[PDB]
Write a protein that binds this ligand. Structure first.
Ligand SMILES: *[C@@H]1O[C@H](CO)[C@@H](O)[C@H](O)[C@H]1NC(C)=O
Lengths: 111, 126, 41, 128
């Protein structure tokens, strides 16, 4: 099958600054990017699917835009309890071969 | 040509079967794409004419099995047997026509051919 | 002219020929993602 | 939009087979598409199988094909799971997630590839 990767694996960015993460694949990613966030010990939650469509019951802070091989997410306010994993998904093949990313972990710079 | 004896005319027929035997004896730019598509349009006519002539030869082979060959009209020495759809000469003369004549002899055609073939093989040696 | 032919729109075999030809046309032209054929006994 | 009445864990000892139940009730069941996902401890998620509820078709990954089947029935309206030759590292938390895919009974469909609704999961306890 085909498998994509997310780089960097983790970002050591303190809260209060803009964060933009993109998962890049060898093939087209302009319209089949799925974004997930899973809290440790719970089932994952979709944030943005189709790279532009917003999952039902999710605060308007999250969003997904961009074009071609450059996709960005804009955050107006950051929430500490929102710190969790970030999963990328691409399902642009039939018969269906879905391969997840590996997840990116972000943590507040505790002293 | 000789294929016109099969089907190349607007022959109305319809007239009496008996009286129909009278008619029996009386019977560009050099474009590459256009050329390559006309090739099949022409082979589809060569097939027709060639099939006409081999079918003619097949009928003559069968007629040679039946004795008379090259003969438009034959008089074989087999009297008509009434066992196949007993009728009378008046009806056969009046109410019949060539296209309308096969509809009653369709079932007896094979046995008629069979007897006609078998009424000859004994003549060769005795 | 002066010819009468016993046509039959219902026992025509050209219809069956067309049906088989169109079946073979769609089987190649339209690709179904997930086909299902019973083929009972 | 969809409520789940899935069974418990009933995970047998290693070296046997497992029958993970996935049950949804309270509403329709046939409209949704179902995706099974594995999650090993500390690793990323891994898609494992998909079944189309109204077509009863299944699609597995190339390497686990011939090693797992996903069976379902509509009279009781549930989806099971079969694992053979179970191996210790295969111990992972499972999810039988579902997605609404339009009025399947009337024939309409969406066949979305995303996953929105997820099950409770599966609980494991490792000891000597
Ligand atoms: C057959 O019909 C044609 C016109 O349709 C007519 O000229 C001809 O005389 C008719 N022949 C017979 C035998 O009825």
């Amino acid at each position: 099958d085909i498998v994509m990767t997310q780089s960097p694996a983790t970002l050591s960015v303190s809260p209060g600054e803009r964060a933009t993460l993109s998962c890049r694949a060898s093939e087209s990613v302009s319209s089949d990017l799925a974004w997930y966030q899973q809290k440790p010990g719970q089932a994952p939650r979709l944030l943005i699917y189709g790279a532009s469509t917003r999952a039902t019951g999710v605060p308007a802070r999250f969003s997904g835009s961009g074009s071609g091989a450059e996709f960005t997410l804009t955050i107006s306010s950051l929430q500490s309890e929102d710190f969790a994993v970030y999963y990328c998904q691409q399902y642009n093949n039939w018969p269906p071969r879905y391969t997840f990313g590996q997840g990116t972990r972000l943590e507040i710079k505790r002293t | 040509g000789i294929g016109a004896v099969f089907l190349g005319f607007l022959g109305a027929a319809g007239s009496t079967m008996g009286a129909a035997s009278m008619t029996l004896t009386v019977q560009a730019p050099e474009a590459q794409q256009h050329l390559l598509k006309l090739t099949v349009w022409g082979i589809k006519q060569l097939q027709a004419r060639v099939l006409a002539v081999e079918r003619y030869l097949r009928d003559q082979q069968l007629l040679g099995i039946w004795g008379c060959s090259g003969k438009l009209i034959c008089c074989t020495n087999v009297p008509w047997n009434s066992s196949w759809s007993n009728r009378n000469l008046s009806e056969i003369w009046d109410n019949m026509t060539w296209l309308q004549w096969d509809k009653e002899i369709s079932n007896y055609t094979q046995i008629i051919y069979g007897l006609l073939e078998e009424s000859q093989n004994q003549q060769e040696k005795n | 002219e002066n010819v009468t032919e016993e046509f039959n729109m219902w026992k025509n075999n050209m219809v069956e020929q067309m049906h088989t030809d169109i079946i073979s046309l769609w089987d190649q032209s339209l690709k179904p993602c997930v086909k299902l054929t019973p083929l009972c006994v | 939009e969809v409520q789940l009445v899935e069974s418990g864990a009933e995970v047998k000892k290693p070296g046997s087979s497992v029958k993970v139940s996935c049950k949804a009730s309270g509403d329709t069941f046939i409209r949704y598409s179902f995706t099974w996902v594995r999650q090993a401890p500390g690793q990323g998620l891994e898609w494992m199988g998909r079944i189309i509820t109204i077509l009863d078709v299944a699609h597995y990954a190339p390497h686990l094909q011939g090693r797992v089947t996903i069976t379902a029935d509509k009279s009781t309206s549930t989806v099971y799971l079969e694992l053979r030759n179970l191996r210790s590292d295969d111990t992972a938390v499972y999810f039988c997630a579902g997605v609404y895919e339009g009025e399947a009974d009337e024939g309409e469909y969406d066949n979305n590839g995303f996953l929105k609704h997820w099950g409770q999961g599966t609980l494991v306890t490792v000891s000597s």
